[PDB]
Write a protein that binds this DNA or RNA. Sequence first.
DNA 1: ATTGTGACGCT
Length: 425
Amino acid sequence: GPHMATGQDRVVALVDMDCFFVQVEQRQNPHLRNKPCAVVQYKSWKGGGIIAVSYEARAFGVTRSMWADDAKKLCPDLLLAQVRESRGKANLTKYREASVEVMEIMSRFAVIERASIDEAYVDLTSAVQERLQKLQGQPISADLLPSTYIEGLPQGQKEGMRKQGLFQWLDSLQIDNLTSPDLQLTVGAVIVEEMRAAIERETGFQCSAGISHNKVLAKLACGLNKPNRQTLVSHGSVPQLFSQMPIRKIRSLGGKLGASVIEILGIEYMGELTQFTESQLQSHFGEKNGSWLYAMCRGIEHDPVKPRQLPKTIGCSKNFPGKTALATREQVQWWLLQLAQELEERLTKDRNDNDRVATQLVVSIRVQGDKRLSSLRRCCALTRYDAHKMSHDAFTVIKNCNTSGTEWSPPLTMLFLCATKFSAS
DNA sequence: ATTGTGACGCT
Ligand SMILES: Nc1nc2c(ncn2[C@H]2C[C@H](O)[C@@H](COP(=O)(O)NP(=O)(O)OP(=O)(O)O)O2)c(=O)[nH]1
Ligand SMILES: [Mg+2]
Ligand SMILES: [Mg+2]
């Protein structure tokens, strides 16, 4: 009753950019705007692999991970932008820099946790307290939430249903109680409207946001009304939402763990989790997962918004599939040097921008026919931002995989260099 | 012959 804490302390938002790499290319190339288009990596093998799709193109069934030739079968007027290639590999620099544009704007409003190239969490609890004090009890106008959806409303066209849901939400608000969680979420959603307006005005990119009380609900909410919309998921809307929410839709249950939850417990939806005691979940899925699951199916999650705007690692990766697998010593050296050269450029820029230095170089390889994605992961010291030195050290650290008596065997299907263990500089 | 990243957990 009174002592059952509800995980309504925080206001957390998740902002994710809509079809981000396509928007970056559409800003640079006006001819792609308001068109079915996608961004691919490479072009020789089946026209390249798609990693980003505009919503127009999605209406035709185009998705990420499709080959571009297959996508063209679904969508014959599809436009394609290609990722830059450098030293024979995909170069994602332009999007990392567009990302930084967006992150720098988000940082003005609150402390953010970069969750990926195109998305960040925001802890808005302090900002909402401030804005609540400034309103001095003034009610909240639907003008202030022009793109906000309220999940589970209305109850009892799209813009119409959205505005109906927003009016039902706003007429039920107790605006006098500075401590009502629902009010706090509302004020958060006003601030997130302002943040998304600033992002679009200062970059031309559009995004969606989830506003809720924790990261998992914010992230789930963010997807509910993409594109170019934001969704408030209240604590009170969790039971209905989760009663038909497949377990795999929750961040981190989309894989092996989620499948075991489904299979062992004999359930399909998030809501059904509430019928198990914490100990039952801890027995089946370990003590941590169990605690996390017991709280999560009630809408409660405690993972903090970490103050971390920058990646913790900087890495360069390239597959060598099938008959392009590296089979000679010269080949492994030339590609370790290409990877090391890109890594060096990125690290030198990181040092000058962010006043820090990586201290550990990780080399990962896959050998042909291996089942695993990574066959060997070995670390060594990183003492200089010198590509020739890094590549030589990667070779020294992996050379004892070669079973040849000039040749390389088994042939390498992946090289991966990664700088980690950063330190102030 | 999705590929290229990046976080975090387990032991
Ligand atoms: N290299 C590479 N880049 C990828 C991959 N997957 C995604 N990206 C890149 C391209 C993506 O633009 C970007 C962000 O990924 P999302 O937020 O998951 N997708 P988006 O923003 O496109 O659409 P939505 O509106 O649904 O959020 O990361 C991949 O497998 N490989
Ligand atoms: Mg996105
Ligand atoms: Mg994303």
